[PDB]
Amino acid sequence: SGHIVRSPMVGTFYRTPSPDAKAFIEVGQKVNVGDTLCIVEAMKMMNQIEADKSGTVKAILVESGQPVEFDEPLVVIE
């Protein structure tokens, strides 16, 4: 695969901050370091997963509301 941003924690994956809000990213969209790609809810903390390398989003491997584990591939860039 390409460059993989993986999950650093166990929790639930979300594409948007809210059901009726915009998705942080979509396929074909360009992103730079620090940009929010998605969310993983862990505990009372709503953790925002950001890009660690700049490029274009290749794929989004997880659907909203689904759980994720440590080191789980979430997003691909370039």
């Binding site: 924690m9 166990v10 759980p67 584990e69 440590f70 080191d71 789980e72």
Partner: protein
């Protein structure tokens, strides 16, 4: 009972708990480090969750990861096993606070018996026999000091460790800052008592185990019951332990470790958790200790009352470790060929298989061989055959060492002390 639980552990104990759960129709969640993707119990579990990288501190000691895992899987309870977080009061607390059942004792009880001082306090209070001591520091009065040595009975031991065997040179021994005194137990045996308490006022003891065979205070061989222990003595110490359980309001399975010399028991520690060597107790009583842990966590009271606990036969356990049998250096690596022993009275407890790599992390114990027999001699003979049948290639193991021990005439006699194994190997 419990719909689904997280097995907060790894290796053989994780496999043991998984089997227990499978039989009870309990859904399993195997939390694992990134280096334990290949664990048998992980491969058998209904759900799996990676909780961190190889190091235990970032995986099996990662409380937030374990709890979150329970949350996303919707588990109702968490089994800690032995080692890791099983005796971690804070962990139990956070498990309960998140709305999950902690399969183990109360946090307050863990701290109580987790601290040397507080543990001793409880035991004396409950009537459990501890190591006789000066009860306070000593002065310059040699009449006093000698009277104290007399009470305790020689030999004695000096601590701030120096031995006195007679009155004549006690005086000089004090020379070698403030000092206390204890009885010196020179040739004791490690004898421990298994207990179960539902945390509802009931508590039973399931005979004892002898774990004298040790290297640097680490158990190598265990057996049950302990040779030379009479049923009246068994009843004495056992009843003491049960009463202690009721007093401290213990819950789950636990073990009271004692040193044993010339008909006396001396409390050292209480393991507030299941122990590695629990299987030898299961063989001779027919009680499934893991299932009992689960029933108690589910809120069920003890189904067994003391009268119904019967000791039948004898059981031995050799711990199989991945290590050089002469220098005892950990021996991680790939198992190139594996075959487990079988036959009547033979019980193999291990997660290893052909092709499985023993990672360069975690304790070195990779299996446990437990043999049962109508008597001690039959148990030992079965252990000989089974060890000879056991094949583990690719990594060094202590199997050959276990063979020597089974062939050891003093072990065959029984009653060897806690220094024997190291005495024989010249360490």
């Amino acid at each position: 009972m419990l719909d689904k639980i997280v097995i907060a552990n790894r290796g053989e104990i994780a496999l043991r708990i998984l089997r227990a759960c499978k039989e009870l129709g309990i859904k399993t969640v195997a939390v694992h480090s990134s280096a334990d993707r290949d664990l048998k119990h992980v491969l058998l579990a209904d759900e799996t969750v990676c909780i961190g990288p190889a190091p235990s501190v970032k995986s099996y000691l990662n409380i937030p990861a374990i709890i979150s895992a329970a949350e996303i899987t919707g588990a109702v309870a968490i089994h800690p096993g032995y080692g890791f977080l099983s005796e971690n009061a804070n962990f139990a607390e956070q498990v309960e606070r998140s709305g999950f059942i902690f399969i183990g004792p109360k946090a307050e009880t863990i701290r109580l018996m987790g601290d040397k001082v507080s543990a001793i306090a409880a035991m004396k209070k409950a009537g459990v026999p501890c190591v006789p001591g000066s009860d306070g520091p000593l002065g310059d009065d040699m009449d006093k000091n000698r009277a104290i040595a007399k009470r305790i009975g020689y030999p004695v031991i000096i601590k701030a460790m120096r031995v006195v065997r007679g009155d004549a040179e006690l005086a000089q021994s004090i020379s070698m800052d403030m000092v206390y005194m204890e009885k010196y137990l020179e040739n004791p045996r490690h004898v421990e008592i298994q207990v179960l308490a539902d945390g509802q006022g009931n508590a039973i003891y399931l005979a004892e185990r002898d774990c004298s065979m040790q290297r640097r205070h680490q158990k190598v061989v265990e057996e049950a019951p302990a040779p030379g222990i009479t049923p009246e003595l068994r009843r004495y110490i056992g009843e003491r332990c049960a009463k202690a359980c009721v007093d401290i309001g213990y819950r789950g399975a636990g073990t009271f470790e004692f040193l044993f010399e010339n008909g006396e028991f001396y409390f050292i520690e209480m393991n507030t958790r299941i122990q590695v060597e629990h299987p030898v107790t299961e063989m001779i009583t027919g009680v499934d200790l893991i299932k009992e842990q689960l029933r108690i966590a589910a809120g069920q009271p003890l189904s067994i009352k003391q009268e119904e606990v019967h000791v039948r036969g004898h059981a031995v356990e050799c711990r199989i470790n991945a290590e050089d049998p002469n220098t005892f250096l950990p021996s991680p690596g790939k198992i190139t060929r594996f075959h487990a022993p079988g036959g009547f009275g033979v019980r193999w407890e291990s997660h290893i298989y052909a092709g499985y790599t023993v990672p360069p992390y975690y304790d070195s114990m990779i299996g446990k061989l437990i043999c049962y027999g109508e008597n001690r001699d039959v148990a030992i003979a079965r252990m000989k055959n089974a060890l000879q049948e056991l094949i583990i290639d690719g990594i060094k193991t202590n199997v050959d060492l276990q063979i020597r021990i089974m062939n050891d005439e003093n072990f065959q006699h029984g009653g060897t002390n806690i220094h024997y194994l190291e005495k024989k190997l010249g360490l």
